[PDB]
Amino acid sequence: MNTISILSTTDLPAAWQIEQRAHAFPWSEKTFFGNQGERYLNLKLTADDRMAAFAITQVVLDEATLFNIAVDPDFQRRGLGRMLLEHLIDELETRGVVTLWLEVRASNAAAIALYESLGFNEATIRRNYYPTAQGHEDAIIMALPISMKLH
Amino acid sequence: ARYFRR
Numbered sequence: 814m815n816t817i818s819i820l821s822t823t824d825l826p827a828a829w830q831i832e833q834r835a836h837a838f839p840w841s842e843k844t845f846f847g848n849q850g851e852r853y854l855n856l857k858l859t860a861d862d863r864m865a866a867f868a869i870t871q872v873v874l875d876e877a878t879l880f881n882i883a884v885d886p887d888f889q890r891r892g893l894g895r896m897l898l899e900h901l902i903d904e905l906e907t908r909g910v911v912t913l914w915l916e917v918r919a920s921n922a923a924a925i926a927l928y929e930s931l932g933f934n935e936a937t938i939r940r941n942y943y944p945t946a947q948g949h950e951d952a953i954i955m956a957l958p959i960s961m962k963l964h
Numbered sequence: 965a966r967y968f969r970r
């Protein structure tokens with residue numbers, strides 16, 4: 814069974830492990846441990862025992878930015894990424910958020926296709942935004958409009 | 965993933 818919950822203090826070491834396993838160029842520890850607290854709606858997905866994924870989001874006004882999503886390699890391509898993303902979107906809609914934003918490596922064909930299938934669109938491109946093992950990569954800036962529902 | 969200089 815899969816259980817999406819808030820990501821709290823106690824959860825951060827497990828997530829930090831996931832951060833370092835799923836990203837070729839992870840955040841720094843300080844940056845990672847610093848993206849919590851006020852205005853963060855941070856979520857984890859638990860599969861049975863293990864934490865399998867996490868997502869870091871910040872809400873300002875009626876827009877949000879997904880700073881980070883990560884499914885641990887052991888748990889990938891099993892639909893948990895989408896599921897977590899879907900829970901987040903529902904949660905942002907109840908919160909009056911109308912636009913979710915994110916950045917993605919231009920060559921992440923996986924992530925892009927996931928986002929596209931969830932309704933994200935390319936807004937703009939930032940050239941050479943990401944480092945690579947041999948230079949830089951473009952960032953695609955993508956916006957998902959979230960329709961307002963009856964409550 | 966957002967990229968930070970931090």
Ligand SMILES: CC(C)(COP(=O)(O)OP(=O)(O)OC[C@H]1O[C@@H](n2cnc3c(N)ncnc32)[C@H](O)[C@@H]1OP(=O)(O)O)[C@@H](O)C(=O)NCCC(=O)NCCS
Pocket residue numbers: 835836882883884885888889890891892893894895896916917918921922923924926927930965
């Ligand atoms: C990308 C990521 C967040 C989600 O992956 P996941 O949990 O495996 O994704 P899901 O199983 O929910 O589905 C992935 C969707 O991506 C697309 N996709 C296309 N090729 C794919 C591939 N080889 N692997 C994964 N997804 C692929 C599909 O639309 C797929 O949905 P499908 O089941 O209908 O084919 C996860 O793989 C991850 O953490 N990767 C490394 C870190 C990263 O790149 N994070 C996002 C940075 S913007």
